[PDB]
Amino acid sequence: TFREDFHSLRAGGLNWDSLPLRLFGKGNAKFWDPADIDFTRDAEDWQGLTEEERRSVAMLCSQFIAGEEAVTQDLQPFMAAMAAEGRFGDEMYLTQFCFEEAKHTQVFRLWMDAVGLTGDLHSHVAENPGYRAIFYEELPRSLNALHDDPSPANQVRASVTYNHVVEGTLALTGYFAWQKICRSRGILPGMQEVVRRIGDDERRHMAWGTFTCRRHVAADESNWDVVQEQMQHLLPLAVTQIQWRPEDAPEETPFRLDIDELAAYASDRAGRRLGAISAARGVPVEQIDVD
Amino acid sequence: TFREDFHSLRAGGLNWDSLPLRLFGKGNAKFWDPADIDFTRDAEDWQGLTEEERRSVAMLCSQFIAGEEAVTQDLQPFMAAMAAEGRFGDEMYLTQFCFEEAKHTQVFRLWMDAVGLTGDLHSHVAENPGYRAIFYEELPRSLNALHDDPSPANQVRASVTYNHVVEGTLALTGYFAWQKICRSRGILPGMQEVVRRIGDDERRHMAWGTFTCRRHVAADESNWDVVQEQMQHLLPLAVTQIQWRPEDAPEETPFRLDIDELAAYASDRAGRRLGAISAARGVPVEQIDVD
Ligand SMILES: CCCCCCCCCCCCCCCC(=O)O
Ligand SMILES: CCCCCCCCCCCCCCCC(=O)O
Ligand SMILES: [Fe+3]
Ligand SMILES: [Fe+3]
Ligand SMILES: [Mn+3]
Ligand SMILES: [Mn+3]
């Protein structure tokens, strides 16, 4: 009762022109190893930051690494959904995606080790109601709903949560924050490289999510309503996450950052996700999903 | 009800000395891209083979690619089991493992495309009762049993099936067969490279499986009885798979292969798996699993 054929033995083999398999090939060509990045200069720069600056960097790094860990775990029901859909190229892509998230977890962990952020860091994520809502609750709920029901609507809700909010709104805003922190000051060249490489990977993750939502919208435009509903539900939580300040928080945010600017940037990113997905409305599904 | 902390934010971070994380690092250092292998000479060699030789090579290649596809899908419940055990380093490793199997599927598919094996090839696996029993039935049954019950005993049964039989008995015998086919004749240099690279990856897969079984045996030596029972159940099926001949089968196996020699080699590989796992009997678990 488990398997009756193999996609890889069908006539015509695997469709290398499919979006997931093109992304798989790009990810192989662009592979990078966290172990090759030297963090010694970052450790020196870390010592020159003020305490308030270290706290803000630790908070951003903690939000990132916990998020990379979360997606590493929470993507897995999508792999099983693609197995149920019979979509083996998408399943293959998701294996690379998931591994890439484990590798992102690794790289942040190595950076933290290098600068000495080796105590318990949960206070930087667990006290933020927006972060908790997304990464402790909404992300795993939406992705695990695919186990009992891998319907197009649930796939779109899961992809909006994972690819269009967690990645395509929050991670992108985080990369912008890192750029503001590091470029203004010429600090943390290792982290600058991390951000470049993880961002390269993220563009493929986001392309997969855009493809997933587009093909479902093309097949049944009711799924566009689902995309908008899920985004309207989640975006306020993402904005809350960005605007949160700890009890210990300085009146002046370090690095001359404007947290409300970050929130506005995030809203713009979310709008771009919606716009990309909206382009599939009225397109025949076979022109998006060659399969 | 889904997540309450993050392994990556705990004091002491991730334990890079753990076996799974050492393997993860090795896999990153040894990454290879299927797209970098030139199969043009293999295509020329393919044209010089007899029909009977092509049929035998197609059979071996089909058994491999379908097996790579099977493990790509069927490993995934182990990732969820490690999430349940709270074993995040093992989960990270399994993401690389799973991706590597997708990449093995890719490389065989590219080789098949290059030589022109692009029709339906199910006749080469679906008619073999040993192959069917393992790859259609026993592998997915044993691995999916971890969803409702990720107990040590079920983990050992799943790892014996996946790592010690599918990989550590059958794949290793298949690599030996490829070596016999290609080295005796100086043919298929692309496939020779494929076999070297996939074999390198397999040694890490098998090391993970050896570790998994060892730590469970060390914790509860009743799991040694489970290892032996599962191996005694599966090895006859693996031998049947190797000895199978199609209806169309020549009286003389091509390439001067002796199928019963391959079966004996497989039995020796299985014995080596058991011997490796048996070394954990009586070892305190903390000396295997530093965690
Ligand atoms: C100092 C103020 C910082 C404000 C916070 C900016 C938003 C950071 C969000 C990080 C979430 C990380 C998600 C990772 C997901 C992925 O890797 O695929
Ligand atoms: C011409 C006779 C050939 C005899 C068959 C030899 C055995 C081949 C078995 C191949 C199984 C492949 C399993 C792959 C698993 C993995 O990649 O992890
Ligand atoms: Fe991502
Ligand atoms: Fe393997
Ligand atoms: Mn990431
Ligand atoms: Mn393999």
XYZ file of C-alpha atoms and ligand atoms in Angstrom:
622
model
C 0.000 0.000 0.000
C 2.944 2.461 -0.366
C 4.520 2.825 -3.801
C 3.504 1.630 -7.229
C 5.905 3.382 -9.660
C 8.914 5.710 -9.901
C 8.891 9.130 -11.500
C 12.506 8.663 -12.522
C 11.705 5.536 -14.638
C 8.826 7.051 -16.574
C 9.190 7.745 -20.238
C 10.783 11.162 -20.684
C 12.516 10.992 -17.264
C 12.496 14.151 -15.202
C 11.525 17.473 -16.728
C 14.616 19.595 -16.314
C 12.746 22.629 -17.650
C 10.406 22.606 -14.671
C 10.826 25.519 -12.275
C 11.742 23.312 -9.240
C 14.358 21.402 -11.162
C 15.846 24.558 -12.630
C 16.121 25.900 -9.072
C 17.676 22.610 -7.909
C 20.337 22.962 -10.582
C 21.011 26.572 -9.658
C 21.342 25.648 -6.016
C 23.913 23.027 -6.902
C 25.874 25.477 -8.998
C 25.772 28.101 -6.212
C 26.576 25.808 -3.274
C 28.670 27.393 -0.525
C 30.079 25.971 2.697
C 29.719 27.925 5.970
C 33.066 26.518 7.067
C 34.842 28.576 4.397
C 33.868 31.946 5.919
C 36.451 33.529 8.270
C 34.796 35.185 11.287
C 37.987 36.303 13.044
C 37.549 39.970 12.011
C 33.912 39.854 13.140
C 35.040 38.755 16.556
C 37.391 41.734 16.735
C 34.664 44.118 15.583
C 32.271 42.667 18.150
C 34.641 43.736 20.926
C 34.530 47.348 19.691
C 30.744 47.643 19.789
C 28.966 49.184 22.746
C 26.870 47.003 25.017
C 23.684 48.395 23.495
C 24.940 47.650 20.005
C 25.853 44.068 20.966
C 22.392 43.566 22.427
C 20.726 44.713 19.187
C 22.991 42.534 17.039
C 22.393 39.552 19.321
C 18.642 40.116 19.046
C 18.758 40.213 15.225
C 21.050 37.195 15.050
C 18.859 35.248 17.512
C 15.728 36.010 15.522
C 17.518 34.770 12.406
C 18.987 31.554 13.749
C 15.788 30.548 15.504
C 13.953 31.268 12.272
C 16.393 29.137 10.240
C 15.884 26.330 12.755
C 12.114 26.756 12.581
C 11.955 26.567 8.792
C 14.359 23.625 8.713
C 11.809 21.713 10.798
C 8.597 23.193 9.494
C 9.225 22.839 5.755
C 9.161 19.080 5.992
C 5.339 18.625 5.663
C 5.560 20.375 2.316
C 7.910 17.608 1.075
C 5.259 15.051 2.016
C 2.572 17.120 0.340
C 4.539 17.103 -2.921
C 4.897 13.340 -2.542
C 1.105 13.176 -2.283
C 0.577 15.516 -5.258
C 2.980 13.152 -7.217
C 5.221 16.144 -7.818
C 8.631 14.604 -7.608
C 10.580 17.546 -9.076
C 9.100 19.786 -6.387
C 9.957 17.147 -3.773
C 13.559 17.095 -4.994
C 13.728 20.862 -4.833
C 12.350 20.878 -1.289
C 15.100 18.509 -0.173
C 17.680 21.087 -1.297
C 15.609 23.913 0.268
C 15.432 22.132 3.615
C 19.157 21.312 3.603
C 19.899 24.948 2.755
C 17.954 26.042 5.835
C 19.954 23.604 7.982
C 23.068 25.166 6.449
C 21.794 28.647 7.304
C 21.301 27.459 10.862
C 24.878 26.209 10.836
C 26.365 29.455 9.508
C 24.649 31.642 12.088
C 25.686 29.239 14.805
C 29.310 29.402 13.675
C 29.202 33.203 13.639
C 27.716 33.252 17.138
C 30.403 30.909 18.381
C 33.106 33.109 16.855
C 31.882 36.287 18.586
C 31.096 34.572 21.871
C 27.288 34.480 21.834
C 27.227 31.107 23.574
C 24.847 31.571 26.487
C 21.142 31.005 26.381
C 19.600 33.472 23.962
C 15.899 32.657 24.172
C 15.138 36.017 25.822
C 15.715 37.607 22.439
C 12.850 35.757 20.715
C 10.563 34.271 23.375
C 9.438 37.617 24.768
C 8.433 39.110 21.441
C 4.698 38.465 20.864
C 4.954 38.878 17.101
C 7.949 36.553 16.809
C 6.245 33.978 19.063
C 3.012 34.149 17.105
C 4.795 33.488 13.811
C 7.600 31.111 14.643
C 6.138 29.211 17.611
C 2.524 29.051 16.380
C 1.480 30.162 12.903
C 4.347 28.725 10.869
C 4.226 25.212 12.336
C 0.367 25.220 12.421
C 0.062 26.197 8.766
C 2.731 23.774 7.564
C 1.598 20.838 9.659
C -1.960 21.274 8.362
C -0.637 19.791 5.111
C -0.261 16.352 6.713
C -3.999 15.663 7.009
C -4.986 17.899 4.113
C -2.458 18.831 1.358
C -5.159 20.723 -0.592
C -4.257 23.586 -2.874
C -5.782 26.061 -0.420
C -3.720 24.679 2.467
C -0.620 24.660 0.254
C -1.159 28.311 -0.585
C -1.675 29.193 3.070
C 1.515 27.311 4.000
C 3.538 28.878 1.192
C 2.282 32.377 2.051
C 3.328 31.772 5.653
C 6.723 30.254 4.851
C 7.859 31.781 1.585
C 5.985 35.068 1.360
C 6.022 36.165 5.011
C 8.801 34.361 6.861
C 11.194 34.543 3.890
C 9.771 37.119 1.538
C 8.806 39.744 4.153
C 10.735 39.106 7.369
C 14.018 37.588 6.168
C 14.327 40.243 3.466
C 13.768 42.986 6.072
C 16.378 41.327 8.232
C 18.897 41.382 5.402
C 18.163 45.094 4.986
C 18.734 45.621 8.700
C 22.049 43.752 8.540
C 23.093 45.899 5.621
C 22.227 49.054 7.564
C 24.184 47.826 10.591
C 27.273 46.634 8.760
C 27.685 48.928 5.765
C 27.279 52.256 7.654
C 30.090 51.213 9.944
C 32.328 48.866 7.946
C 31.932 46.087 10.490
C 31.291 42.337 10.483
C 32.605 41.415 7.010
C 31.930 37.774 7.770
C 28.273 38.506 8.494
C 28.152 40.635 5.353
C 29.218 37.574 3.395
C 26.721 35.356 5.259
C 23.924 37.767 4.340
C 24.956 37.795 0.686
C 25.043 33.994 0.471
C 21.884 33.268 2.463
C 20.096 35.972 0.450
C 21.147 34.239 -2.781
C 19.651 30.983 -1.444
C 16.508 32.848 -0.292
C 15.787 34.101 -3.754
C 15.414 30.486 -4.875
C 13.278 29.646 -1.858
C 11.053 32.617 -2.668
C 10.927 31.660 -6.361
C 9.667 28.225 -5.377
C 7.031 29.761 -3.148
C 6.003 32.185 -5.878
C 5.696 29.289 -8.322
C 3.660 27.209 -5.846
C 1.180 29.969 -5.181
C 1.012 30.977 -8.841
C 0.224 27.495 -10.093
C -2.566 27.073 -7.573
C -3.982 30.524 -8.368
C -3.842 29.771 -12.084
C -5.699 26.506 -11.537
C -8.396 27.985 -9.232
C -8.485 31.722 -8.735
C -10.297 31.226 -5.430
C -6.757 30.559 -4.192
C -5.979 34.221 -4.805
C -8.517 35.027 -2.107
C -6.705 32.563 0.154
C -3.363 34.259 -0.549
C -4.768 37.661 0.349
C -6.505 36.372 3.471
C -3.366 34.669 4.774
C -1.226 37.730 4.049
C -3.727 40.025 5.754
C -3.661 37.727 8.777
C 0.127 37.496 9.000
C 1.476 40.870 7.983
C 0.330 42.587 11.220
C 2.182 39.908 13.207
C 5.324 40.502 11.176
C 5.067 44.245 11.739
C 4.587 43.608 15.498
C 7.654 41.390 15.497
C 9.760 44.115 13.898
C 8.484 46.871 16.156
C 8.938 44.933 19.407
C 11.290 46.321 22.016
C 12.509 44.390 25.081
C 12.001 45.647 28.578
C 15.727 46.522 28.578
C 15.392 48.486 25.356
C 17.236 51.755 24.739
C 15.220 54.864 23.851
C 17.487 55.367 20.834
C 17.775 52.233 18.669
C 21.436 51.480 17.939
C 23.080 51.932 14.570
C 20.715 54.810 13.868
C 18.101 52.275 12.849
C 14.519 53.300 12.542
C 12.409 50.250 13.489
C 9.337 51.825 11.925
C 11.285 52.199 8.663
C 11.999 48.495 8.838
C 8.299 47.869 9.345
C 7.441 49.975 6.287
C 10.063 48.133 4.228
C 8.510 44.843 5.345
C 5.064 45.993 4.230
C 6.538 46.895 0.823
C 8.135 43.453 0.532
C 4.795 41.822 1.340
C 3.135 43.924 -1.361
C 5.715 42.759 -3.855
C 4.951 39.125 -2.944
C 1.268 39.678 -3.542
C 1.979 41.423 -6.840
C 4.145 38.576 -8.072
C 1.505 35.999 -7.238
C -1.310 38.123 -8.697
C 0.378 37.883 -12.119
C -0.870 34.309 -12.390
C -4.527 35.311 -12.288
C -6.003 34.448 -15.614
C -2.911 32.612 -16.926
C -3.624 29.019 -17.949
C -1.974 26.743 -15.429
C -0.010 24.885 -18.126
C 1.906 28.094 -18.929
C 3.144 28.307 -15.302
C 3.480 24.602 -14.430
C 4.987 22.674 -17.296
C 5.319 19.844 -14.792
C 1.040 23.391 20.875
C 4.016 23.171 18.435
C 7.326 24.656 19.555
C 8.570 25.937 22.875
C 12.334 26.518 22.384
C 15.181 26.406 19.850
C 18.170 24.109 20.043
C 20.291 26.746 18.347
C 19.656 29.330 21.144
C 20.506 27.047 24.042
C 23.597 27.660 26.068
C 26.533 25.958 24.368
C 24.871 26.154 20.915
C 25.181 23.105 18.715
C 27.627 20.341 19.542
C 29.943 20.266 16.566
C 31.683 17.183 17.963
C 28.525 15.125 17.589
C 28.671 12.426 14.925
C 25.770 13.882 12.832
C 27.254 17.343 12.810
C 30.705 16.057 11.938
C 29.109 14.215 9.005
C 27.202 17.371 8.010
C 30.479 19.267 7.868
C 32.148 16.543 5.834
C 29.265 16.502 3.401
C 29.618 20.230 2.902
C 33.332 19.927 2.309
C 32.807 17.065 -0.181
C 29.874 18.553 -2.109
C 29.814 17.737 -5.822
C 27.446 18.797 -8.589
C 26.093 16.194 -11.050
C 26.101 18.871 -13.738
C 29.911 18.927 -13.715
C 30.271 15.324 -14.946
C 30.712 14.886 -18.729
C 28.773 11.870 -20.044
C 29.648 12.291 -23.728
C 32.191 9.421 -23.692
C 29.663 7.204 -21.900
C 27.210 7.801 -24.688
C 29.821 6.700 -27.218
C 30.678 3.609 -25.180
C 26.990 2.758 -24.865
C 26.754 2.496 -28.652
C 29.556 -0.097 -28.693
C 27.902 -2.451 -26.213
C 25.884 -5.428 -27.371
C 22.135 -5.460 -26.872
C 22.487 -7.923 -24.007
C 25.074 -5.725 -22.338
C 22.848 -2.640 -22.677
C 19.958 -4.541 -21.128
C 22.068 -5.520 -18.099
C 23.397 -1.981 -17.654
C 19.890 -0.553 -17.990
C 18.658 -3.002 -15.355
C 21.413 -2.013 -12.894
C 20.924 1.687 -13.573
C 17.128 1.368 -13.198
C 17.481 -0.445 -9.892
C 19.781 2.344 -8.714
C 17.749 5.347 -9.790
C 14.499 3.912 -8.489
C 16.288 3.175 -5.236
C 17.645 6.742 -5.003
C 14.114 8.020 -5.603
C 12.728 5.643 -2.986
C 15.175 6.698 -0.281
C 14.713 10.375 -1.123
C 11.032 9.928 -0.254
C 11.269 7.323 2.459
C 13.955 8.930 4.628
C 11.680 11.805 5.499
C 9.891 10.136 8.487
C 13.280 9.752 10.123
C 13.695 13.566 10.054
C 10.402 13.874 11.929
C 11.467 11.190 14.375
C 14.626 13.148 15.206
C 12.447 16.221 15.691
C 10.424 14.185 18.187
C 13.536 12.823 19.937
C 14.695 16.535 20.208
C 17.804 15.568 18.274
C 18.382 18.617 16.174
C 21.929 17.754 15.038
C 20.620 14.459 13.670
C 17.745 16.335 12.013
C 20.227 18.689 10.351
C 22.279 15.762 9.138
C 19.195 14.057 7.708
C 18.381 17.160 5.675
C 21.779 16.844 3.965
C 21.302 13.053 3.608
C 17.915 13.486 1.950
C 19.192 16.198 -0.409
C 22.134 13.957 -1.306
C 19.706 11.208 -2.314
C 17.793 13.679 -4.502
C 21.160 14.570 -6.040
C 21.905 10.888 -6.644
C 18.555 10.622 -8.381
C 19.533 13.596 -10.514
C 22.937 12.201 -11.504
C 21.567 8.846 -12.622
C 18.834 10.607 -14.535
C 21.382 12.780 -16.329
C 23.460 9.725 -17.227
C 20.376 7.946 -18.560
C 19.460 10.960 -20.642
C 22.984 11.116 -22.068
C 22.978 7.473 -23.215
C 19.389 7.532 -24.428
C 17.604 5.507 -21.741
C 14.504 7.683 -21.982
C 11.642 5.235 -22.411
C 9.689 3.661 -19.624
C 12.018 1.492 -17.577
C 9.710 0.033 -14.940
C 10.075 -3.478 -16.403
C 13.566 -3.528 -14.948
C 12.413 -3.198 -11.319
C 8.690 -3.987 -11.131
C 9.056 -7.621 -12.165
C 11.723 -8.484 -9.625
C 10.039 -9.889 -6.481
C 12.994 -9.088 -4.239
C 13.294 -5.516 -5.509
C 9.519 -5.014 -5.166
C 9.477 -6.425 -1.655
C 12.218 -4.052 -0.505
C 11.622 -0.839 -2.385
C 7.838 -0.924 -2.867
C 6.933 -2.475 0.506
C 9.474 -3.018 3.274
C 11.413 0.237 3.029
C 8.397 2.563 3.050
C 6.559 0.398 5.664
C 9.491 0.416 8.074
C 10.217 4.124 7.667
C 6.616 5.269 7.816
C 6.112 3.295 11.038
C 8.156 6.052 12.694
C 5.317 8.559 12.259
C 3.003 6.958 14.831
C 5.790 5.403 16.874
C 9.383 6.787 16.728
C 10.533 4.308 19.413
C 14.115 3.143 19.569
C 13.080 -0.302 18.329
C 11.268 1.175 15.324
C 14.223 3.486 14.667
C 16.576 0.521 14.647
C 14.293 -1.420 12.318
C 14.082 1.589 9.977
C 17.830 2.206 10.050
C 18.590 -1.481 9.426
C 16.243 -1.368 6.440
C 17.528 1.921 5.024
C 21.161 2.199 6.031
C 22.269 -1.378 6.618
C 20.364 -3.182 3.852
C 19.368 -0.703 1.157
C 22.634 1.257 1.447
C 25.031 -0.951 3.337
C 24.225 -4.246 1.561
C 22.535 -3.517 -1.768
C 24.045 -0.186 -2.838
C 27.530 -1.405 -1.934
C 26.983 -4.567 -4.016
C 25.775 -2.376 -6.840
C 28.930 -0.284 -6.699
C 30.934 -3.516 -6.885
C 28.916 -4.590 -9.913
C 29.525 -1.237 -11.612
C 33.218 -1.590 -10.939
C 33.217 -5.074 -12.470
C 31.345 -3.814 -15.537
C 33.381 -0.681 -16.136
C 36.917 -1.482 -15.011
C 37.262 -4.833 -16.872
C 36.397 -3.053 -20.084
C 37.517 0.565 -19.677
C 34.034 1.875 -20.382
C 31.667 4.486 -18.951
C 34.171 6.854 -17.287
C 31.317 9.159 -16.375
C 29.530 6.367 -14.519
C 32.830 5.441 -12.884
C 32.985 8.964 -11.504
C 29.312 8.847 -10.444
C 29.990 5.634 -8.521
C 33.014 7.141 -6.789
C 31.100 10.251 -5.709
C 27.857 8.554 -4.667
C 29.923 5.955 -2.786
C 31.688 8.754 -0.889
C 28.269 10.149 0.103
C 27.049 6.634 1.019
C 29.809 6.152 3.514
C 28.413 9.098 5.474
C 24.869 7.789 5.148
C 26.047 4.421 6.455
C 28.018 6.077 9.273
C 24.853 7.836 10.386
C 22.940 4.579 10.313
C 25.698 2.810 12.223
C 25.647 5.570 14.837
C 21.839 5.438 15.130
C 21.759 1.710 15.678
C 24.775 1.780 17.988
C 23.352 4.425 20.289
C 20.083 2.553 20.640
C 21.889 -0.750 21.249
C 24.112 0.898 23.846
C 21.067 2.308 25.622
C 19.043 -0.958 25.554
C 20.725 -4.092 24.302
C 17.323 -5.570 23.468
C 17.732 -3.408 20.359
C 20.543 -5.711 19.271
C 17.946 -8.461 19.006
C 15.853 -6.103 16.878
C 18.824 -5.410 14.589
C 19.435 -9.113 14.068
C 15.755 -9.874 13.513
C 15.361 -7.132 10.909
C 18.546 -8.178 9.111
C 17.479 -11.823 9.097
C 14.143 -10.763 7.623
C 15.611 -8.542 4.909
C 18.807 -10.196 3.773
C 16.985 -13.037 1.942
C 14.981 -10.415 0.028
C 18.170 -8.613 -0.941
C 19.732 -11.863 -2.123
C 16.553 -12.610 -4.148
C 16.743 -9.159 -5.691
C 20.333 -9.729 -6.791
C 19.704 -13.206 -8.147
C 16.588 -12.275 -10.136
C 16.636 -12.755 -13.882
C 14.007 -11.357 -16.279
C 12.045 -13.549 -18.605
C 14.251 -12.180 -21.416
C 17.415 -13.073 -19.536
C 20.504 -14.475 -21.256
C 21.909 -17.815 -20.078
C 25.324 -16.167 -19.754
C 25.224 -12.962 -17.678
C 27.005 -10.149 -19.527
C 30.349 -8.714 -18.522
C 31.336 -12.113 -17.166
C 29.431 -11.289 -14.007
C 28.555 -14.001 -11.587
C 25.235 -13.006 -9.961
C 25.770 -15.541 -7.195
C 29.138 -13.904 -6.452
C 27.297 -10.626 -6.093
C 24.890 -12.311 -3.705
C 27.777 -13.649 -1.609
C 29.396 -10.202 -1.560
C 26.084 -8.753 -0.371
C 25.901 -11.277 2.464
C 29.442 -10.281 3.494
C 28.477 -6.600 3.486
C 25.471 -7.371 5.685
C 27.739 -9.243 8.098
C 30.014 -6.240 8.291
C 27.019 -4.028 9.162
C 26.037 -6.347 11.970
C 29.616 -6.468 13.235
C 29.896 -2.696 13.308
C 26.671 -2.339 15.253
C 27.557 -5.192 17.627
C 30.575 -3.171 18.818
C 28.209 -0.965 20.802
C 27.002 -3.807 23.005
C 28.147 -3.070 26.488
C 29.470 0.437 25.708
C 27.860 3.151 27.831
C 25.617 5.202 25.593
C 27.365 8.465 26.530
C 30.583 7.200 24.900
C 28.760 6.765 21.551
C 26.262 9.651 21.703
C 27.877 12.761 23.090
C 24.729 14.525 21.920
C 17.338 45.712 15.687
C 15.942 45.544 15.090
C 15.791 44.304 14.176
C 14.372 44.152 13.550
C 14.012 42.758 13.039
C 14.090 42.601 11.499
C 13.433 41.298 11.048
C 14.251 39.989 11.198
C 13.506 38.744 10.924
C 14.294 37.509 10.828
C 13.484 36.209 10.480
C 14.261 35.087 9.858
C 13.556 34.129 9.029
C 14.400 33.170 8.279
C 13.691 32.301 7.217
C 14.533 31.651 6.129
O 15.687 31.644 6.360
O 14.067 31.023 5.174
C 23.479 -7.267 -13.662
C 23.155 -7.750 -12.249
C 23.032 -6.614 -11.207
C 22.726 -7.115 -9.763
C 22.142 -6.078 -8.805
C 23.159 -5.507 -7.783
C 22.447 -4.722 -6.683
C 21.996 -3.274 -7.008
C 21.153 -2.630 -5.981
C 20.900 -1.192 -6.139
C 20.048 -0.522 -5.002
C 20.217 0.959 -4.828
C 19.935 1.544 -3.532
C 20.314 2.966 -3.362
C 20.241 3.538 -1.929
C 21.025 4.804 -1.612
O 21.395 5.387 -2.565
O 21.124 5.292 -0.483
Fe 14.717 30.350 3.216
Fe 22.409 6.698 0.558
Mn 17.201 30.553 5.576
Mn 22.034 7.293 -2.801
